[PDB]
Amino acid sequence: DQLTEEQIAEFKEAFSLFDKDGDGTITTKELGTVMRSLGQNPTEAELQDMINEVDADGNGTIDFPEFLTMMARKMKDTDSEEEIREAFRVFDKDGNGYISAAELRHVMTNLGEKLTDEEVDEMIREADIDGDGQVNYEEFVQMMTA
């Protein structure tokens, strides 16, 4: 956090524009208000998704470090961290992220591509510390990203 004073002032200006209330912090109701002001139809479910995906430490609403880090994100044009989400997002036929690893591997390792015969399944099973399988993105991410 070695931001220069001019950049601190610029980000403070941005935060002031975002925070219409200024008690320091706009609340979810006026998050939805400004979102619909931009011209999007708001839903309470998606607003809850927004707030509980941006908030941390259970403080609620918005926080200055939280805003600073989420603005540290969404600036890189491309990456291999926040764009590999699809690798577990798209193959969830059930959609809750609890579909069997063996079944998804078998059904998705044949779309014009073939890799091995159950060796990939064995490797996936051994990758998990507890051998959970199913949809366990922690071990897969630990193996892939680093």
Place this chain on the structure above:
Amino acid sequence: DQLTEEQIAEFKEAFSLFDKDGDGTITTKELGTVMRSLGQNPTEAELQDMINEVDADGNGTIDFPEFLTMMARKMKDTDSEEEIREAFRVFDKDGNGYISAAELRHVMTNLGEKLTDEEVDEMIREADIDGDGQVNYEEFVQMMTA
């Protein structure tokens, strides 16, 4: 009523087009339906008007002689009978056709035109059999048309 048989058949075809029901006679409700099918927003007051001028003898709905006579009307491009209707319409400030004849004559015999001094009022008063004045178009039409 010396209509030729071919013209009788043509007008019967027109009557068949107008009468969707064919009990011989469409009713005010489906008068409104067909009128709104022509693309005019219907009001019950104007439908009751339409029907109460078109109908005669208290028979209701529509009648073949009534249909024939109103289609005998609305065919001449212009005339001096069905276009002079406004002479008692445009000068009814109250709008009920009961405004004083002397007052309307005084207020409307000065719009860039001058005719006489109370001679017209005396003539109008003498024209009415009972000297009703006000808005009595019976005597005016009698002295106008013939």
Place this chain on the structure above:
Amino acid sequence: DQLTEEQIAEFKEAFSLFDKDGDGTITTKELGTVMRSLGQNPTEAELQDMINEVDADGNGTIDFPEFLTMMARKMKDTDSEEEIREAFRVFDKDGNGYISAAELRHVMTNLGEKLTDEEVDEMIREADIDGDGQVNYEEFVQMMTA
């Protein structure tokens, strides 16, 4: 039903596209859902007409042989079987398919075309096994198509 395996797979792909549910069979509610997704305003009466005209053996919803046969239909650009259907609907003034055969023949055998004098009526009466007349398309179809 000697369809080749590749065409079987293609029609299975089509069936998978049609059956969003995949219990093997979408139900009338989501028939209407997909139909309105195609951009048509649905009515329960027309949905019931669709489902009962497509269904057979009282199984309900959709069936694979039923789907195969109705896709066997609707592929021919022209024919004399499913296009002569109007011959018993265009002349039903009452609209329920129970208008008198003699009356419809008399009223429709004069629109710029003349055939005979009651010979057609006698032939139509004799065509029916029970002499039902009225609107009996079974005998007429058996006589005309084959």
Place this chain on the structure above:
Amino acid sequence: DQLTEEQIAEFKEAFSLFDKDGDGTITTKELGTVMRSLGQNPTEAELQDMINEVDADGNGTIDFPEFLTMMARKMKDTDSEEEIREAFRVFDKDGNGYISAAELRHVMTNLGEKLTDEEVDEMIREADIDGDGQVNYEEFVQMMTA
């Protein structure tokens, strides 16, 4: 009030156009009616605002001298009286016209412009007869306009 008779007649014509009722005076309901006829969505709050600046002496609705004076206004293309109105509205962050004079002066005497050091504050404090400060436009207007 040295208006000539022709101008009196012209303004009487304008008043007749404005007053549809003619009891001499349209009421706030039909003020809103004609305003929405002009094509503007009316609100009761803004209608009450309009009527309670235009009205005087508690007579209500509209008055001929009031109409004449408000049409005497809004005929000057530009001036220094009815355009300096913003000097006490643009700096009211609270918006009720009761924000502290010292605070507003301090916050608004730095937008790329600088005048002095508390000399302006002392002058503003001394300008008020009672030293009210805050938002006291009477003394400021008396000092500025004349």
Place this chain on the structure above:
Amino acid sequence: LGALRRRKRLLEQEKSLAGWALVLAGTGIGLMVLHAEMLWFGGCSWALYLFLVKCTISISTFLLLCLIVAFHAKEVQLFMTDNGLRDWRVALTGRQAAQIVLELVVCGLHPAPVRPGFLGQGEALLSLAMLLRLYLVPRAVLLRSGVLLNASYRSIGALNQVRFRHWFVAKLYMNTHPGRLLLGLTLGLWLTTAWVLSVAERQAVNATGHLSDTLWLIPITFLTIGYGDVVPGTMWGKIVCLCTGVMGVCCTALLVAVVARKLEFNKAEKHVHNFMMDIQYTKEMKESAARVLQEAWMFYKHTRRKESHAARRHQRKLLAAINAFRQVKLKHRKLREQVNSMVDISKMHMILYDLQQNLS
């Protein structure tokens, strides 16, 4: 009620008179064409054929005058019987008198016989002026449609404000024939305009008065390139060429609305096209995701084993696959947003139907 029968008879007589007017105008223009070109093709020593043609055209104009007078008399009779009065003189007024006088003087002019193929370009002006009869055609064609006779059409026009007397047939013809008559008129005007242009250049052995040489500049005048090899600079030639140019450039601006309508896309097939675009994009996205995961696993394989140039190339391939996935996702998002947008009419119909069905 006899007014209806009287009006019907009047309209029938007017139709017959209009037909006779059109056919006699055709005979007159044919006689004028026959008289023309005779000096430049043939010989003037016959001394009888041209006289016979002139006398025949004189009788043709006389009969045309008579029928025009009859037609105007019948139309003023129709006006009188519509406005029921009992005075012959009251029917006429300034406007109709001016119109009939103008029509008479238009018909009044006539190339009459006086008593090497060089007519002097001054004695044929009256014969050339006979083209003015073109305005007599619309009056016949409008009434010859027969749409006015149908009482049902007037009945439907009633209970509504239409007052169809003119431009109504034009609107109906434009609706039923967007360009069918337009193309024919544009293609047929060229012969007439070339024929009328080949008068001012009629100079003996000038290689410009002939019809074949004449019919070269008008097509390019209607066009825009107009390099102008002929450059005709005779009397009134500048006016004629300017008129041809202005009418051509006015007529250039067309065909755009009809070609756009033909190339337009109906919503009915638009719906199914969008549906299949959705399914194809889903298939493409699934294929891209499979490619991404397949390439990703090999990176962990080479991480477990020794890394090398193959591992670096596979990292490059992984980046390329990620970029392709992003492109596919962005395109699918664009198409989905587009299809979700618009759809105003269907959506408001559905929402109003739902509101009506909600009831209490």
Place this chain on the structure above:
Amino acid sequence: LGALRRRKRLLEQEKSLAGWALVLAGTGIGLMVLHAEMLWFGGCSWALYLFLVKCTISISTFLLLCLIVAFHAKEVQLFMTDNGLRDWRVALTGRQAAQIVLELVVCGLHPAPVRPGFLGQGEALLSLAMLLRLYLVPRAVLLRSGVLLNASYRSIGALNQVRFRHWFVAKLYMNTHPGRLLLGLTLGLWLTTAWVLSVAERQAVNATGHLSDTLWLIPITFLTIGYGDVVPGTMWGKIVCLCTGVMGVCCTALLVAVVARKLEFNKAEKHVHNFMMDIQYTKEMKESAARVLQEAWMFYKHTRRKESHAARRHQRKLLAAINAFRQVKLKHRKLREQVNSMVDISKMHMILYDLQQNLS
């Protein structure tokens, strides 16, 4: 309340001079037209009237100068009395002073008496610069129109933030009847540009003067056909040809939406035409159904009794009837879909009326 009366007096005084501006425009034109025609169409020996013409036009320029000074004084007085100030100096500023100087120098440049009928080089450039006074018409017509005079118009416009200062008169003039004004503006400028084209091409019978062969080149360039029979070789001639061509091609734009607007098609005739097509289409469907059923019945006798080529011909006729039936059905379906759609305004009005009438 004397401010309103003083403003009315000021506007009356402004009207008293706006008309005289265009009144003196006529003698401004006469400054150049008569001198230019006389110097070339006659001998130079007519030196007894040149001095009188020069003195008269000098007096005219002096009168125009006084008129402009008076107008500017009255308008700055109006500005002062509107702002309600007292100091004479505060009213003036840089912008209006610069405008005053620009007007003075525009009207200041006038030809002056210096003391074979050939105009030496550009000795008439000062008279040519007088033609710049063409931008006087829009201000004069704006201030002369009575729309600004009425109090009710400003009264209504005040409550809607309309700012009656400029371009409102232009918008209304375009709205009331666009065709006549634009056509007149396009037609009038041809004479002026033809007149100004011959500024140095007169020479001495060089086949480029006498105001002839110059009224022809400009319309050819405007039509964009570009015959190119003769091209002005002078640099001034070249640039004036280029600018007249670019302005002609600029004016060529638009002038085509007028026919589309005139060929409009309102709701009432739309609905009556749809009713007409509906009845025609059901009649055609009934006729086709009768035809196909009669053909089918005719097929039965040859079905029962075989023959040669009779069954074949009957089958051919049956197929033709089926094809015609399909065509009629498809066309009717298209028309029904079209009439069902594009009813958004009427449908929403009807549904909102139904919702209002539902109440509870």
Place this chain on the structure above:
Amino acid sequence: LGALRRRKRLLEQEKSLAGWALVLAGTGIGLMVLHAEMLWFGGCSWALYLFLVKCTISISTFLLLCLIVAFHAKEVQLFMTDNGLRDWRVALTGRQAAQIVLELVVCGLHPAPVRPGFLGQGEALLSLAMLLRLYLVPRAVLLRSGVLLNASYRSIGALNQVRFRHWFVAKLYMNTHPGRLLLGLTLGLWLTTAWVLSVAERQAVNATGHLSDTLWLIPITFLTIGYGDVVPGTMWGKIVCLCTGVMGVCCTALLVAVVARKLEFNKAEKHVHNFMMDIQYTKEMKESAARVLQEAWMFYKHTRRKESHAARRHQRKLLAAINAFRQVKLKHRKLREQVNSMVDISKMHMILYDLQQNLS
């Protein structure tokens, strides 16, 4: 259920025949554009080469005739099998018979071996007429596409009640990428039109029969300029250049819609632009208000102190600040009022959502 298999086999055979037709048309066009060039290049003493070329052309025409007969026979076969079929001679559609006879006679004419070059102008008319074979590509291209084979395609399209006989492939191709093939066609037609004009402009010694010279006077058209460095004096040249001019005028209306479509402006960009405008305008309003208030305070401070010429400039500064404030206010109102009511679809969607959420 064997009808489906029979139709699939028929479609496959039709695809094979169409492919062979296209490739043999390519062979024919390859055998073209050499016979004409051989006479004009070098000499013609090698009669064996021209004899072999004519023999090969005859064989190619015979094979094209055979394949066309086979294709149309299979089309008749599929049409016959579609309906209730009994005999080969049953259907034999008369219009189809006329079409096939017309196709035969179009293919019937062909260059033939008869037994100082450039072939003059009389002979080889049939050889030059082989360009008419271009009509085959539109028939082959749509059937070449595999969209017809997809069962899901017609399955979904059936419920929409739209026919897929023709022009829908063209609509889909236009929708996929407008202008893509349009630009290629426009750039490729120039070579063919220059080549066909070369024969019309062919001359023994004049500098008009060369391909390079012929390649220039067509591009001068379609540019609406027409410099006219050369003029085609041949009547065939006249008609062909008129055709090129009219087609160029017709095609000049291109790219105009798609450039605007590419330069469009989506709702997201407009929303962020309005946000930028809001923030910038409130900032500017605050700055202007501060400026005007500071100027007013400056004037008030210098009222009673040093009352002299110095205080005069402050009044003009105050008026300038007031005018700037008025302009800023007017612009802000102008844009805010427009953007408030700009949203219609989103506004009504929100309104209906609120109405639905209200419930009871």
Place this chain on the structure above:
Amino acid sequence: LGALRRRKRLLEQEKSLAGWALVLAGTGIGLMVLHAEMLWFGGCSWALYLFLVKCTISISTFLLLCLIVAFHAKEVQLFMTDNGLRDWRVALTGRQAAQIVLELVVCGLHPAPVRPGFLGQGEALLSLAMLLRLYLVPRAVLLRSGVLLNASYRSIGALNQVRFRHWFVAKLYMNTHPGRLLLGLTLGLWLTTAWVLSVAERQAVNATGHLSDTLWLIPITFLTIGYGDVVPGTMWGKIVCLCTGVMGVCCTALLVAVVARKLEFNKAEKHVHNFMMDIQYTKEMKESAARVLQEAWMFYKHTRRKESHAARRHQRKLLAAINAFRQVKLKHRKLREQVNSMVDISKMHMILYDLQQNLS
């Protein structure tokens, strides 16, 4: 969090290098033009000025080499730091290698010293190729604007995702003020095209290749008029004039958006004008009714006694005032229908507000 600072520094360096790139391109074109002008005007080989100029332009190209090398290297550095990686050539700009090599060889080619006016095209081709440096304008202008630098804008644009890579600055510039730059560009490219046409056409006087004569013809081609006074006989001249003609005719499709939606007529003036016409038509109808009633009374007065020519004239005047009354009525009806039926947005907003206020 230092990635933000690193990216900001990289963007600043990229902007600085883009500015220096534009400066060096300007220096290069300035050095190139002067040699071409000097070799043909003034002293041909009066001194070593030509050698000095060639050396200077060589040094300028040498600096440009390293300048674009640094620019692309910093772009690759930005791409490297965007993706967390620890390898120099892991990205290496695989596909972009072709682009960077192509741009390098575009910059690499340059006029070079070899060691009367006899200019040769071979030696001047490299100098003529320097016009390709114009490609740097978008790259410099994209970084010139400071919108990309602001963090709050990217903050607000993250939601409702819109990528900002390209065409966004063009859209903003077009929407801010469309009329600012297109006219300047059109006026500026004329000088460049005239200069490039003058180059490589100055054989030996011959009234060709000089700037003055060649500058005139290009605007003629752009205006799409043509005169054919002089044409470029060179093949390079032919292709360059064809290119100028095609770009000019492409540019003619313009000013349509300048006139439309700019000569528009918005809600406020529409409403006030409708009120204006409403009251005016009310007054006109009242006047017409008074006139017709007075004429009727006059007819009564001269009907009671002395029926004569005066009575006939009064009847004529009555029939005159009748249908004039009807014309006024019809016009008022048309206007009232148009005003009542065209209100869509305001009417739906009012009806939805009424529905919301109804509640239960």
